Design a protein around this nucleic acid. Sequence first.
RNA 1: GCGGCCCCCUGGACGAAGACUGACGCUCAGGUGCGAAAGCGUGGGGAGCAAACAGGAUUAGAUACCCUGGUAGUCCACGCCGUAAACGAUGUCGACUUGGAGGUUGUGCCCUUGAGGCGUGGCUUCCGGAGCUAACGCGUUAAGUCGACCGCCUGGGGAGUA
Lengths: 271, 88, 116, 65, 70, 100
Amino acid sequence: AVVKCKPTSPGRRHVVKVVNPELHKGKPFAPLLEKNSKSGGRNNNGRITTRHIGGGHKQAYRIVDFKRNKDGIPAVVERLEYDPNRSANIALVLYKDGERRYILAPKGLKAGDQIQSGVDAAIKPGNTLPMRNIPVGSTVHNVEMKPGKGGQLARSAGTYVQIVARDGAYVTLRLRSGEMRKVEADCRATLGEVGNAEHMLRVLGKAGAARWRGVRPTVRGTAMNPVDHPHGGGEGRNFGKHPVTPWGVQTKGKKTRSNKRTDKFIVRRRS
Amino acid sequence: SLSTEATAKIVSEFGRDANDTGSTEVQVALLTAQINHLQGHFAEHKKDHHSRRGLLRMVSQRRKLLDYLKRKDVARYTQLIERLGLRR
Amino acid sequence: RKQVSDGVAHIHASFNNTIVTITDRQGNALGWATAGGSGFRGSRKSTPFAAQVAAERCADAVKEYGIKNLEVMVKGPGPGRESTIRALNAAGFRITNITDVTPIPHNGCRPPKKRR
Amino acid sequence: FCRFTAEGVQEIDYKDIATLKNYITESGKIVPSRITGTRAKYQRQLARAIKRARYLSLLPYTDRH
Amino acid sequence: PVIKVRENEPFDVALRRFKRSCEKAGVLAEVRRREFYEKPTTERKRAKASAVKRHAKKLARENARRTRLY
Amino acid sequence: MRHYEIVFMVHPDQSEQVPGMIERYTAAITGAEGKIHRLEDWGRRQLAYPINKLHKAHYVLMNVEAPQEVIDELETTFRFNDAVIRSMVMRTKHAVTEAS
RNA sequence: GCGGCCCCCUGGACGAAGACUGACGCUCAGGUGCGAAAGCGUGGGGAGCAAACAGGAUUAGAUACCCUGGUAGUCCACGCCGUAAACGAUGUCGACUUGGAGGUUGUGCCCUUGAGGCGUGGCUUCCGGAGCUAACGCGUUAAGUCGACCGCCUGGGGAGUA
Ligand SMILES: [Mg+2]
Ligand SMILES: [Mg+2]
Ligand SMILES: [Mg+2]
Ligand SMILES: [Mg+2]
Ligand SMILES: [Mg+2]
Ligand SMILES: [Mg+2]
Ligand SMILES: [Mg+2]
Ligand SMILES: [Mg+2]
Ligand SMILES: [Mg+2]
Ligand SMILES: [Mg+2]
Ligand SMILES: [Mg+2]
Ligand SMILES: [Mg+2]
Ligand SMILES: [Mg+2]
Ligand SMILES: [Mg+2]
Ligand SMILES: [Mg+2]
Ligand SMILES: [Mg+2]
Ligand SMILES: [Mg+2]
Ligand SMILES: [Mg+2]
């Protein structure tokens, strides 16, 4: 529920908060937590590769179960938890045999709801089953690309994928970007549509609100000097150049896709 | 909308007789069963502006009856509003 | 070539032209002839006569295909709606049946605005 | 004329196609009550019956499908 | 308006049969109506005037039926 | 206890399937204290217009009296069943034995 | 203001025969609520049409009518705006006062013995009687004869403007 903060301070004037009361208020599940050390954008060589990453609150990786290859064995949603790593709230799921796991939360999942996996499962928001069985035209999420790989499409918050048409052994999915892509029909795909759909409507209001998410300041090229950046230079805000990345290659229009080995599966480029 | 079985049962409780429909206690106790039943309807269909005018008529027709009853019999009025729960 | 036996004559009448296409029963065109391209440029191709001339011209250009029977399918309003049918008999064809195909929406797409 | 659907009172349904086929032109258009004579209380029950049978494909929407 | 040319007729009879169907189906009148958008307010005024003159002339002929001109 | 006039069409190449499903629906209808009055099987019919090709179909009439919550489950079994096309659920009352 | 068909939830109206409450009624300054289209904000969607805009014609000019294209918008969700020739230019409630021809929806009796006849209610379109009106016209759904309550008007422009 987007609530606008009252302007008691210049820096709280503009904040908008997305507060969800249904989330769990205590501590996470211990046996499914791990260590997640930060990097800052530094690889083996220790040199930053991606810029504007650094700082931010400490987090812990919650092992979310993406494959969902526990067929049958109905499961009950216990609670919805806030997950710092993702953009969607996760849900603790208890199976009949006594095993607890984590799942991405669909849009219509609450405590006490029942889900299950497998080919035998029923068409219901939260129930995963191979795309060979999901009726054409349906809205799905957590789609896979290769059978058993784990789940790679429509995993953000409020994101979904349409099953446009099934042709033989391959299914054409309308993705979120606007592409139409073929995937093998046997890839599992959790039925529904991911939750936290209001994640867009939040605004941060101040600079520190983004600084404490590991986002360091971004310096424009035109402020730089000609040695540091192709734009550079000037005596009083001169640009006069076709915009380029700090490494020469042109930005603002120039396509860069080149795979030539997975262009079979791209039915229609993004519009 | 107060099916016959649910509307011939309120008359029995509040009516002095079993065939007394129209007494001010019966009428107000019948109206209250519908104002308290449309709350769940209008908590979902908020934009039902045309059905709300029907609700805002059942509300006012009840208040007109209570004012008549209170002036006519104070003892009966103060006993009905607690047997039902209202005047807030 | 291919000496087809039964063909279908598609007439596309309008308020400004008349396009005649003769196709086989599978929907593959063989020849066509319009009114404006038949030396009737201007305010004369609308007339129900320029449809007759093109209908004779379109009756030709299938001479090599040896068509003997036809089905006429009239589409759209306009003057070239009936005069262009009898011109197919004048070429000797045997009309099997006359079907009026005309797109009529069931209050669907919005039409343009009125002229003044 | 006006006698049908008013003599032998009934509530028309969409199963008796043989009856409804007497109230549609060759193209599937419903014939107006002015032409036939059916009273207004029954043309509404005969307009909604034809539209009910069309969805079930018991009658054609048009003469060319 | 589908018409199937039956057995052994002259052409003008079959063609004049098909034209009778187009006139009876009102295809030509429908198309001329749908070429341009008529505003919803101009239709209601056009229908009302086409039910007044129908009525007014109906009374007029009777009101002139009980009259001797010469 | 609300009356209904459920009528559905099946795939023509599933005509042997219908006897199996007509009793399953009636078992579910009766399984919740629900009556049933007319179970006419119209047989195989020719469509007036082609729907997803399929010039023919097999019709079934049910005329069921069931609680309002059972039917909503039954329409779902009509949707996700690939061999059921154009299910229609009317709401009526009363009688039986018409159209054949 | 509402026009395909189906389901779910839901408001109002009318009719026949009864039972019941027993003046519980009418109007209403402030107040509250609903309120076409255009317009605004956030997030979607976009087939057709189309303010703005571009080109072609007409013209003495044509930053318009006509033509070829076309963005906002029209569509959906939630909020805001609160105005129209929002018009029957006619406030709401009640009583009384000659007729005719229809529409639509109920109900009663009798030769439904056969597309019948005779009544009684609700809504509604057209013509006209007395009466009213400056005239046009209204004319049982009054602009007729009256009763209660409210709103508004007091020469034209300036101005529904500062
Ligand atoms: Mg930035
Ligand atoms: Mg510098
Ligand atoms: Mg350089
Ligand atoms: Mg400078
Ligand atoms: Mg410069
Ligand atoms: Mg045009
Ligand atoms: Mg006021
Ligand atoms: Mg608007
Ligand atoms: Mg908008
Ligand atoms: Mg927008
Ligand atoms: Mg234009
Ligand atoms: Mg005003
Ligand atoms: Mg109006
Ligand atoms: Mg006014
Ligand atoms: Mg009032
Ligand atoms: Mg008059
Ligand atoms: Mg002002
Ligand atoms: Mg103004």
